[PDB]
Amino acid sequence: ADARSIYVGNVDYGATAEELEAHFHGCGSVNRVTILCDKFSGHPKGFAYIEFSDKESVRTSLALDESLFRGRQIKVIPKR
Amino acid sequence: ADARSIYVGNVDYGATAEELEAHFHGCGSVNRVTILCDKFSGHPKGFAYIEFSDKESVRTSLALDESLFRGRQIKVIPKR
């Protein structure tokens, strides 16, 4: 599961799983979206895990590193 | 951390951490909100963890079991 997952940095407290899936939908079938937020107002502090159905989607999704999601650049790496 | 946490059942793919914190804000200071979704369209399938700053907020938050959040009744229990 972690081998089929990416970490997505710079995700805010207004993000939804539907929005995240929609951002990564072209990379492959998504199994689970986990959003983790440590701030709920003011400057955001959080990230997400996207778990793809197939391992191959992970490499594909790396092209979305630095993409704009909800008005800010996201960091995309394989889940550490 | 798990001793300071609740499981929140029946959370949809349109929920945000800010909305969840706002629902539980009266129970005590929140440290982290984790949203976990297995469906991103159609009938939702997901849940959340709310990690409170203080253990005492967990018992308090149990009163919000069956409360309406985003138009549906949520299930609130101490994180298993």
Coordinates of N, CA, C and O in Angstrom, one line a residue:
Chain A
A1 N 0.8 -1.3 0.0 CA 0.0 0.0 0.0 C 0.8 1.3 0.0 O 0.6 2.2 -0.8
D2 N 1.9 1.3 0.8 CA 2.8 2.4 0.8 C 3.7 2.5 -0.5 O 4.0 3.5 -0.9
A3 N 3.9 1.3 -1.1 CA 4.6 1.2 -2.4 C 3.7 1.7 -3.5 O 4.1 2.0 -4.6
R4 N 2.4 1.8 -3.2 CA 1.4 2.4 -4.2 C 1.0 3.8 -3.9 O 0.0 4.3 -4.5
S5 N 1.7 4.4 -3.0 CA 1.3 5.7 -2.4 C 2.2 6.9 -2.7 O 3.5 6.6 -2.7
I6 N 1.7 8.1 -2.8 CA 2.5 9.3 -2.8 C 2.2 10.2 -1.6 O 1.0 10.2 -1.0
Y7 N 3.2 10.9 -1.1 CA 3.0 12.0 -0.2 C 2.7 13.3 -1.1 O 3.4 13.5 -2.1
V8 N 1.8 14.1 -0.6 CA 1.4 15.4 -1.3 C 1.6 16.4 -0.2 O 0.8 16.5 0.7
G9 N 2.6 17.3 -0.4 CA 2.8 18.4 0.6 C 2.1 19.6 0.2 O 1.8 19.9 -1.0
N10 N 1.9 20.5 1.2 CA 1.3 21.8 1.0 C -0.2 21.8 0.7 O -0.7 22.3 -0.3
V11 N -0.9 21.0 1.5 CA -2.4 20.8 1.4 C -3.0 21.5 2.5 O -2.6 21.4 3.7
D12 N -4.1 22.3 2.2 CA -4.6 23.2 3.3 C -5.9 22.6 3.9 O -6.4 21.6 3.5
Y13 N -6.4 23.3 5.0 CA -7.5 22.8 5.8 C -8.8 22.9 5.1 O -9.9 22.5 5.6
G14 N -8.8 23.5 3.9 CA -10.0 23.6 3.1 C -10.1 22.5 1.9 O -11.0 22.5 1.2
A15 N -9.0 21.7 1.8 CA -9.0 20.7 0.8 C -9.9 19.5 1.1 O -10.1 19.1 2.3
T16 N -10.5 19.0 0.1 CA -11.4 17.7 0.2 C -10.7 16.6 -0.6 O -9.9 16.8 -1.4
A17 N -11.1 15.4 -0.2 CA -10.7 14.1 -0.9 C -11.1 14.1 -2.3 O -10.4 13.6 -3.2
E18 N -12.3 14.6 -2.6 CA -12.9 14.6 -3.9 C -12.0 15.5 -4.8 O -11.6 15.2 -5.9
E19 N -11.6 16.7 -4.3 CA -10.7 17.6 -5.0 C -9.3 17.0 -5.3 O -8.8 17.1 -6.4
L20 N -8.8 16.3 -4.3 CA -7.5 15.6 -4.4 C -7.5 14.5 -5.4 O -6.6 14.4 -6.3
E21 N -8.5 13.7 -5.4 CA -8.7 12.6 -6.3 C -8.8 13.2 -7.7 O -8.2 12.7 -8.7
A22 N -9.6 14.3 -7.9 CA -9.8 14.9 -9.2 C -8.5 15.4 -9.8 O -8.2 15.3 -10.9
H23 N -7.6 15.9 -8.9 CA -6.3 16.4 -9.3 C -5.4 15.3 -9.8 O -4.7 15.5 -10.8
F24 N -5.5 14.1 -9.2 CA -4.7 12.9 -9.6 C -5.3 11.9 -10.5 O -4.7 10.9 -10.9
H25 N -6.6 12.2 -10.9 CA -7.4 11.2 -11.6 C -6.8 10.6 -12.9 O -6.9 9.5 -13.2
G26 N -6.2 11.5 -13.6 CA -5.5 11.2 -14.8 C -4.3 10.3 -14.7 O -3.8 9.7 -15.7
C27 N -3.7 10.2 -13.4 CA -2.6 9.3 -13.2 C -2.9 7.9 -13.0 O -2.0 7.0 -13.2
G28 N -4.2 7.6 -12.8 CA -4.6 6.2 -12.5 C -5.7 6.1 -11.4 O -6.0 7.1 -10.8
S29 N -6.3 5.0 -11.3 CA -7.3 4.7 -10.3 C -6.8 4.9 -8.9 O -5.7 4.3 -8.5
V30 N -7.5 5.6 -8.1 CA -7.2 5.9 -6.7 C -8.0 5.0 -5.7 O -9.2 4.8 -5.9
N31 N -7.3 4.5 -4.7 CA -7.9 3.6 -3.7 C -8.3 4.4 -2.5 O -9.4 4.2 -2.0
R32 N -7.4 5.2 -2.0 CA -7.7 6.0 -0.7 C -7.0 7.3 -0.8 O -5.9 7.4 -1.3
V33 N -7.7 8.3 -0.2 CA -7.1 9.6 0.0 C -7.1 9.8 1.5 O -8.2 9.7 2.1
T34 N -5.9 10.1 2.1 CA -5.8 10.5 3.5 C -5.3 12.0 3.5 O -4.3 12.3 2.9
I35 N -6.1 12.8 4.2 CA -5.7 14.2 4.4 C -5.3 14.4 5.9 O -6.1 14.0 6.8
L36 N -4.1 15.0 6.2 CA -3.7 15.2 7.5 C -3.4 16.7 7.8 O -2.5 17.2 7.1
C37 N -4.1 17.3 8.6 CA -4.0 18.8 8.9 C -3.6 19.1 10.3 O -4.3 18.5 11.2
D38 N -2.6 19.9 10.5 CA -2.2 20.3 11.9 C -2.6 21.8 12.2 O -2.4 22.2 13.3
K39 N -3.1 22.5 11.2 CA -3.7 23.8 11.4 C -5.0 23.9 10.7 O -5.2 23.2 9.6
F40 N -6.0 24.6 11.3 CA -7.4 24.6 10.8 C -7.9 26.0 10.5 O -9.0 26.3 10.1
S41 N -7.0 27.0 10.6 CA -7.2 28.4 10.3 C -5.9 29.1 10.2 O -4.9 28.5 10.5
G42 N -5.9 30.3 9.6 CA -4.7 31.0 9.4 C -3.8 30.3 8.4 O -4.3 29.8 7.5
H43 N -2.5 30.4 8.6 CA -1.5 29.7 7.7 C -1.7 28.2 7.8 O -1.8 27.7 8.9
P44 N -2.0 27.5 6.7 CA -2.2 26.1 6.7 C -0.9 25.3 7.0 O 0.2 25.8 6.9
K45 N -1.1 24.0 7.5 CA 0.0 23.1 7.7 C -0.6 21.7 7.6 O -1.3 21.2 8.5
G46 N -0.3 21.1 6.5 CA -0.8 19.8 6.3 C -0.3 19.2 5.0 O 0.4 19.8 4.2
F47 N -0.7 17.9 4.8 CA -0.3 17.1 3.7 C -1.4 16.0 3.4 O -2.3 15.9 4.2
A48 N -1.2 15.2 2.4 CA -2.0 14.1 2.1 C -1.2 12.9 1.6 O -0.1 13.0 1.1
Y49 N -1.9 11.7 1.7 CA -1.4 10.5 1.0 C -2.4 10.1 0.0 O -3.6 10.1 0.3
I50 N -2.0 9.8 -1.2 CA -2.9 9.3 -2.2 C -2.4 7.8 -2.5 O -1.2 7.6 -2.9
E51 N -3.3 6.9 -2.2 CA -3.0 5.5 -2.5 C -3.6 5.1 -3.8 O -4.9 5.1 -3.9
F52 N -2.8 4.8 -4.8 CA -3.3 4.3 -6.1 C -3.6 2.8 -6.1 O -3.0 2.1 -5.2
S53 N -4.5 2.4 -6.9 CA -4.8 1.0 -7.1 C -3.6 0.1 -7.6 O -3.4 -1.0 -7.2
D54 N -2.8 0.8 -8.5 CA -1.7 0.1 -9.2 C -0.4 1.0 -8.9 O -0.4 2.2 -9.0
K55 N 0.7 0.2 -8.6 CA 2.0 0.8 -8.4 C 2.5 1.7 -9.5 O 3.2 2.7 -9.2
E56 N 2.2 1.4 -10.7 CA 2.6 2.2 -11.9 C 2.1 3.7 -11.8 O 2.8 4.6 -12.4
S57 N 1.0 3.9 -11.2 CA 0.5 5.3 -11.1 C 1.3 6.2 -10.3 O 1.3 7.4 -10.5
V58 N 2.1 5.7 -9.4 CA 3.0 6.5 -8.5 C 4.0 7.2 -9.4 O 4.1 8.5 -9.3
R59 N 4.8 6.5 -10.3 CA 5.7 7.2 -11.1 C 5.1 8.3 -12.0 O 5.6 9.4 -12.1
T60 N 3.9 7.9 -12.6 CA 3.1 8.8 -13.4 C 2.8 10.1 -12.7 O 2.9 11.2 -13.2
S61 N 2.3 10.0 -11.4 CA 1.9 11.1 -10.6 C 3.0 12.1 -10.3 O 2.7 13.2 -9.9
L62 N 4.3 11.6 -10.4 CA 5.4 12.5 -10.0 C 5.5 13.7 -11.0 O 6.1 14.7 -10.6
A63 N 4.9 13.6 -12.1 CA 4.9 14.8 -13.1 C 4.0 15.9 -12.5 O 4.2 17.0 -12.9
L64 N 3.2 15.6 -11.5 CA 2.4 16.6 -10.8 C 3.1 17.4 -9.7 O 2.5 18.3 -9.1
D65 N 4.3 17.0 -9.4 CA 5.1 17.8 -8.5 C 5.2 19.2 -9.0 O 5.4 19.4 -10.2
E66 N 5.0 20.2 -8.1 CA 5.0 21.6 -8.4 C 3.7 22.1 -9.1 O 3.6 23.3 -9.4
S67 N 2.8 21.2 -9.4 CA 1.5 21.7 -10.0 C 0.7 22.5 -9.0 O 1.0 22.5 -7.8
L68 N -0.1 23.4 -9.6 CA -1.0 24.2 -8.7 C -2.2 23.5 -8.3 O -2.9 22.9 -9.2
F69 N -2.5 23.4 -7.0 CA -3.7 22.7 -6.5 C -4.2 23.7 -5.5 O -3.4 24.1 -4.6
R70 N -5.4 24.1 -5.6 CA -6.1 25.1 -4.7 C -5.2 26.4 -4.5 O -5.1 26.9 -3.4
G71 N -4.7 26.8 -5.6 CA -3.9 28.1 -5.7 C -2.5 28.0 -5.1 O -1.8 29.0 -5.0
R72 N -2.0 26.8 -4.8 CA -0.6 26.7 -4.4 C 0.1 25.5 -5.0 O -0.5 24.6 -5.4
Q73 N 1.5 25.6 -5.0 CA 2.3 24.5 -5.6 C 2.3 23.4 -4.6 O 2.7 23.5 -3.4
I74 N 2.0 22.2 -5.0 CA 2.1 21.0 -4.2 C 3.4 20.3 -4.5 O 4.0 20.3 -5.6
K75 N 3.9 19.6 -3.4 CA 5.1 18.7 -3.5 C 4.6 17.3 -3.6 O 3.8 16.8 -2.8
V76 N 5.1 16.6 -4.6 CA 4.7 15.2 -4.9 C 5.9 14.3 -4.8 O 6.9 14.5 -5.7
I77 N 6.0 13.3 -3.9 CA 7.1 12.3 -3.8 C 6.5 11.0 -3.5 O 5.4 10.9 -2.9
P78 N 7.2 9.8 -3.8 CA 6.7 8.5 -3.3 C 6.7 8.6 -1.8 O 7.5 9.2 -1.1
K79 N 5.6 8.0 -1.2 CA 5.5 8.0 0.3 C 6.8 7.4 0.9 O 7.2 6.2 0.5
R80 N 7.4 8.1 1.8 CA 8.7 7.9 2.4 C 8.7 6.6 3.2 O 9.7 5.9 3.4
Chain B
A1 N -1.3 9.7 21.9 CA -2.0 10.4 20.8 C -3.4 9.7 20.5 O -4.4 10.3 20.3
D2 N -3.3 8.3 20.4 CA -4.6 7.6 20.2 C -5.5 7.6 21.4 O -6.7 7.6 21.3
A3 N -4.9 7.8 22.6 CA -5.7 8.0 23.8 C -6.3 9.4 23.9 O -7.2 9.6 24.6
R4 N -5.8 10.3 23.0 CA -6.4 11.6 22.9 C -7.3 11.8 21.7 O -7.7 12.9 21.3
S5 N -7.6 10.7 21.0 CA -8.3 10.7 19.7 C -9.6 10.1 19.7 O -9.9 9.1 20.4
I6 N -10.5 10.6 18.8 CA -11.7 9.9 18.4 C -11.8 9.5 17.0 O -11.2 10.1 16.1
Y7 N -12.5 8.4 16.7 CA -13.0 8.0 15.4 C -14.3 8.7 15.1 O -15.2 8.8 16.0
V8 N -14.4 9.3 13.9 CA -15.7 9.9 13.5 C -16.1 9.2 12.2 O -15.4 9.3 11.2
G9 N -17.2 8.4 12.3 CA -17.7 7.7 11.2 C -18.7 8.5 10.3 O -19.3 9.4 10.8
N10 N -18.9 8.1 9.1 CA -19.8 8.7 8.1 C -19.4 10.1 7.7 O -20.2 11.0 7.8
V11 N -18.2 10.2 7.2 CA -17.6 11.5 6.8 C -17.4 11.3 5.2 O -16.9 10.3 4.8
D12 N -17.9 12.3 4.5 CA -17.9 12.2 3.0 C -16.7 12.8 2.4 O -15.9 13.5 3.0
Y13 N -16.6 12.6 1.0 CA -15.4 13.1 0.3 C -15.4 14.6 0.0 O -14.5 15.1 -0.6
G14 N -16.5 15.3 0.5 CA -16.5 16.7 0.4 C -16.2 17.4 1.7 O -16.2 18.6 1.8
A15 N -15.9 16.6 2.8 CA -15.6 17.2 4.1 C -14.2 17.8 4.1 O -13.3 17.3 3.5
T16 N -14.0 18.9 4.8 CA -12.7 19.5 5.1 C -12.3 19.4 6.5 O -13.1 19.2 7.4
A17 N -11.0 19.5 6.8 CA -10.5 19.5 8.2 C -11.0 20.7 9.0 O -11.2 20.7 10.2
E18 N -11.1 21.9 8.3 CA -11.6 23.1 8.9 C -13.0 22.9 9.4 O -13.4 23.2 10.5
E19 N -13.9 22.3 8.6 CA -15.2 22.0 8.9 C -15.3 21.0 10.1 O -16.1 21.2 11.0
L20 N -14.5 19.9 10.1 CA -14.4 19.0 11.2 C -14.0 19.6 12.5 O -14.6 19.4 13.5
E21 N -12.9 20.4 12.4 CA -12.4 21.1 13.6 C -13.6 22.0 14.2 O -13.8 22.0 15.4
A22 N -14.2 22.7 13.3 CA -15.3 23.6 13.7 C -16.4 22.9 14.4 O -17.0 23.4 15.3
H23 N -16.7 21.7 13.9 CA -17.8 20.8 14.5 C -17.4 20.4 16.0 O -18.2 20.4 16.9
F24 N -16.1 20.1 16.2 CA -15.6 19.7 17.5 C -14.9 20.7 18.4 O -14.5 20.5 19.5
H25 N -14.9 22.0 17.9 CA -14.2 23.1 18.5 C -14.5 23.3 20.0 O -13.7 23.6 20.8
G26 N -15.8 23.2 20.3 CA -16.4 23.4 21.6 C -16.0 22.3 22.6 O -16.1 22.5 23.8
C27 N -15.4 21.2 22.1 CA -15.0 20.1 23.0 C -13.7 20.2 23.6 O -13.3 19.6 24.6
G28 N -12.9 21.1 23.0 CA -11.5 21.3 23.4 C -10.6 21.6 22.2 O -11.0 21.4 21.0
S29 N -9.4 22.0 22.5 CA -8.3 22.3 21.5 C -8.0 21.0 20.7 O -7.7 20.0 21.3
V30 N -8.0 21.1 19.4 CA -7.6 20.1 18.4 C -6.2 20.2 17.9 O -5.7 21.2 17.6
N31 N -5.5 19.0 17.9 CA -4.1 19.0 17.4 C -4.0 18.6 16.0 O -3.3 19.2 15.3
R32 N -4.8 17.6 15.6 CA -4.7 17.1 14.2 C -6.0 16.5 13.8 O -6.8 15.9 14.6
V33 N -6.4 16.8 12.5 CA -7.5 16.1 11.9 C -7.0 15.3 10.8 O -6.2 15.8 9.9
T34 N -7.3 14.0 10.8 CA -7.1 13.1 9.7 C -8.4 12.7 9.0 O -9.3 12.1 9.7
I35 N -8.5 12.9 7.7 CA -9.7 12.4 6.9 C -9.2 11.3 6.1 O -8.2 11.4 5.3
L36 N -10.0 10.1 6.1 CA -9.7 9.0 5.3 C -10.9 8.6 4.4 O -11.9 8.2 5.0
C37 N -10.8 8.7 3.1 CA -11.9 8.4 2.2 C -11.5 7.3 1.2 O -10.5 7.3 0.6
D38 N -12.5 6.4 1.0 CA -12.3 5.3 0.1 C -13.2 5.4 -1.1 O -13.0 4.6 -2.1
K39 N -14.1 6.4 -1.1 CA -14.9 6.7 -2.3 C -14.8 8.2 -2.5 O -14.7 9.0 -1.5
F40 N -14.8 8.7 -3.7 CA -14.6 10.1 -4.1 C -15.7 10.7 -5.0 O -15.7 11.8 -5.4
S41 N -16.7 9.8 -5.2 CA -17.9 10.2 -5.9 C -19.0 9.2 -5.6 O -18.7 8.2 -5.0
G42 N -20.3 9.6 -5.9 CA -21.4 8.7 -5.6 C -21.6 8.5 -4.1 O -21.4 9.5 -3.4
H43 N -22.0 7.3 -3.6 CA -22.2 7.1 -2.2 C -20.8 7.2 -1.5 O -19.9 6.6 -2.0
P44 N -20.7 8.1 -0.5 CA -19.4 8.2 0.2 C -19.1 7.0 1.1 O -19.9 6.2 1.4
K45 N -17.8 6.9 1.4 CA -17.3 5.8 2.3 C -16.0 6.4 2.9 O -14.9 6.4 2.3
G46 N -16.1 6.8 4.2 CA -14.9 7.4 4.8 C -15.2 7.7 6.3 O -16.3 7.6 6.8
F47 N -14.1 8.2 6.9 CA -14.2 8.5 8.3 C -13.0 9.5 8.6 O -12.3 9.8 7.7
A48 N -12.9 9.9 9.9 CA -11.9 10.8 10.3 C -11.4 10.4 11.7 O -12.1 9.8 12.4
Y49 N -10.2 10.9 12.0 CA -9.7 10.9 13.4 C -9.5 12.3 13.8 O -8.9 13.1 13.1
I50 N -10.0 12.7 15.0 CA -9.7 14.0 15.6 C -8.8 13.7 16.8 O -9.2 13.0 17.7
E51 N -7.6 14.3 16.8 CA -6.7 14.2 17.9 C -6.8 15.5 18.7 O -6.4 16.6 18.2
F52 N -7.3 15.4 19.9 CA -7.4 16.5 20.8 C -6.0 16.8 21.5 O -5.2 15.8 21.7
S53 N -5.8 18.0 21.9 CA -4.6 18.4 22.7 C -4.6 17.7 24.1 O -3.5 17.3 24.6
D54 N -5.8 17.6 24.7 CA -5.9 17.0 26.0 C -6.9 15.8 26.0 O -7.9 15.9 25.3
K55 N -6.5 14.8 26.7 CA -7.3 13.6 26.8 C -8.8 13.8 27.3 O -9.7 13.1 26.9
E56 N -9.0 14.8 28.1 CA -10.3 15.1 28.7 C -11.3 15.5 27.6 O -12.5 15.3 27.7
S57 N -10.9 16.0 26.4 CA -11.7 16.4 25.4 C -12.4 15.2 24.7 O -13.5 15.3 24.1
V58 N -11.8 14.0 24.8 CA -12.4 12.8 24.2 C -13.7 12.5 24.8 O -14.7 12.4 24.0
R59 N -13.8 12.4 26.1 CA -15.1 12.1 26.8 C -16.1 13.2 26.4 O -17.3 12.8 26.1
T60 N -15.7 14.4 26.5 CA -16.6 15.5 26.1 C -17.2 15.4 24.7 O -18.4 15.6 24.5
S61 N -16.3 15.0 23.7 CA -16.7 14.9 22.3 C -17.7 13.8 22.1 O -18.4 13.8 21.0
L62 N -17.8 12.8 23.0 CA -18.8 11.7 22.8 C -20.2 12.1 22.8 O -21.1 11.4 22.2
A63 N -20.5 13.3 23.4 CA -21.9 13.9 23.3 C -22.2 14.2 21.8 O -23.4 14.4 21.5
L64 N -21.3 14.4 20.9 CA -21.5 14.7 19.5 C -21.8 13.4 18.7 O -22.1 13.5 17.5
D65 N -21.8 12.2 19.3 CA -22.2 11.1 18.6 C -23.7 11.3 18.1 O -24.5 11.8 18.9
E66 N -24.0 10.9 16.9 CA -25.3 11.1 16.3 C -25.7 12.5 15.9 O -26.7 12.8 15.3
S67 N -24.8 13.5 16.2 CA -25.0 14.9 15.7 C -25.0 14.9 14.1 O -24.4 14.0 13.4
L68 N -25.6 15.9 13.6 CA -25.6 16.2 12.2 C -24.4 17.0 11.8 O -24.1 18.0 12.3
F69 N -23.6 16.4 10.8 CA -22.5 17.1 10.3 C -22.6 16.9 8.8 O -22.7 15.7 8.3
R70 N -22.6 18.0 8.0 CA -22.7 18.0 6.6 C -24.0 17.2 6.1 O -23.9 16.5 5.2
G71 N -25.1 17.4 6.9 CA -26.3 16.8 6.5 C -26.5 15.3 6.9 O -27.5 14.7 6.5
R72 N -25.6 14.7 7.6 CA -25.7 13.3 8.0 C -25.3 13.1 9.4 O -24.5 13.8 10.0
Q73 N -25.8 12.0 10.1 CA -25.4 11.7 11.4 C -24.0 11.0 11.5 O -23.8 10.1 10.7
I74 N -23.2 11.6 12.3 CA -21.9 11.0 12.5 C -21.8 10.1 13.7 O -22.6 10.2 14.7
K75 N -21.0 9.1 13.6 CA -20.7 8.2 14.7 C -19.4 8.6 15.4 O -18.4 8.8 14.7
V76 N -19.4 8.9 16.7 CA -18.3 9.3 17.5 C -18.0 8.3 18.6 O -18.8 8.0 19.4
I77 N -16.8 7.7 18.6 CA -16.3 6.8 19.6 C -14.8 7.1 19.8 O -14.1 7.6 19.0
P78 N -14.3 6.7 21.1 CA -12.8 6.8 21.2 C -12.1 5.9 20.2 O -12.6 4.8 19.8
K79 N -11.0 6.4 19.6 CA -10.2 5.7 18.6 C -9.9 4.3 19.1 O -9.3 4.2 20.2
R80 N -10.3 3.3 18.4 CA -10.2 1.9 18.8 C -8.8 1.4 19.0 O -8.5 0.5 19.7

